């Protein structure tokens, strides 16, 4: 009862946090530009996210551009980093975890819909680690990560905690069945 309540709240939190990370732009306070060619540049502080990059300060404060991820084993990294499959697949897996948790509130007989939720959450956390590494690794080849990156990092922790909690609930259901039989 109370354990399922924590799970529901934690599930939403991680989903919400991760959707706010993949959508915002405050990932990496870099030092670049925001505009393109014209008939010199303006290297000013630029909070750059996954898809867009607005110049924090400078004469063009608030102009977001489209990060150009393509300026053997390096092409593959770019493609993955450019399509943000991993940070987007974590959001797809956390959402499917919520459906599984919600489904298990209307069909109590099926105990395997709770284990599914746990695996989804745990796998979502694992897909958000590859996202972090891919991000950092590709971004490499002075900076300061922002709150958007930390929501992605914080999402993992919340998701992993929901993951163990869901596994515990699965075991608890089956323990009741092994005591009443």
């Amino acid at each position: 009862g109370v354990q399922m309540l924590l799970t529901i709240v934690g599930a939403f939190a991680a989903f919400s946090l991760m959707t706010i990370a993949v959508g915002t732009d405050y990932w990496l306070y870099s030092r670049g530009v925001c505009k393109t060619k014209s008939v010199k540049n303006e290297e000013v502080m630029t909070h750059s996210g996954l898809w867009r990059t607005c110049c924090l300060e400078g004469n063009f404060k608030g102009l977001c551009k489209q990060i150009d991820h393509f300026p053997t084993a390096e092409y593959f990294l770019r493609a993955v980093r450019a399509s943000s499959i991993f940070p987007i697949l974590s959001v797809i897996l956390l959402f499917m975890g919520g459906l599984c948790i919600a489904a298990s509130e209307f069909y109590k007989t099926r105990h395997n819909i709770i284990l599914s939720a746990g695996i989804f959450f745990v796998s979502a956390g694992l897909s958000n680690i590859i996202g972090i590494i891919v991000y950092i690794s590709a971004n490499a080849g002075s900076y300061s990560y922002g709150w958007s990156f930390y929501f992605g990092a914080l999402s993992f922790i919340i998701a992993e905690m929901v993951g163990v909690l869901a596994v515990h609930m699965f075991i608890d259901r089956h323990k009741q069945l092994r005591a009443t039989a």
Partner: protein, 145 residues
């Protein structure tokens, strides 16, 4: 030339340290999951890999220390094996890069206390925290009595 309190973390970058924490929280959870998720293994806990012992085993592995509980299934061992390989590389990289940081000074002497003094602070801090966590429980048990 100037030493810092938490200057023992210099070899491995900030991101490396951050991702080690994430990989520790991940291996532990995954180790727990496999071991205990199957309802066709209990007869009682088939093994000792709960959510608490898993965290301890992962931490132990990384610190190159003893093996209280040891994985025995096939899925546990795969998790253990990759974690041991990760640890190995990472712990060999720290030492290897620390030997570089202590040679070819760029802007040899016997390491002084100022170079490894942040660790002592963490050590004493941990001891203090442990005593607190032990007396908080104690009190809690005492009132219940």
């Amino acid at each position: 030339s100037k030493p810092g309190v938490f200057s023992f973390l210099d070899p491995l970058a900030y991101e490396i340290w951050m991702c080690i924490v994430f990989a520790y929280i991940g291996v532990s959870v995954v180790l727990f999951l496999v071991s205990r998720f199957s309802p066709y293994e209990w007869h009682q806990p088939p093994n000792e890999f709960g959510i608490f012992n898993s965290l301890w085993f992962s931490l132990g592995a990384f610190m190159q220390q003893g093996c209280d509980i040891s994985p025995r299934s096939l899925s546990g061992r795969i998790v253990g094996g990759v974690w041991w390989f990760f640890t190995l590389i990472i712990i060999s990289s720290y030492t290897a890069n620390l030997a570089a940081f202590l040679t070819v000074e760029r802007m040899t002497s016997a390491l002084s206390l100022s170079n490894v003094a942040g660790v002592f602070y963490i050590l004493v801090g941990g001891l203090g925290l442990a005593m607190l966590v032990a007396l908080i429980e104690f009190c809690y048990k005492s009132r219940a009595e």
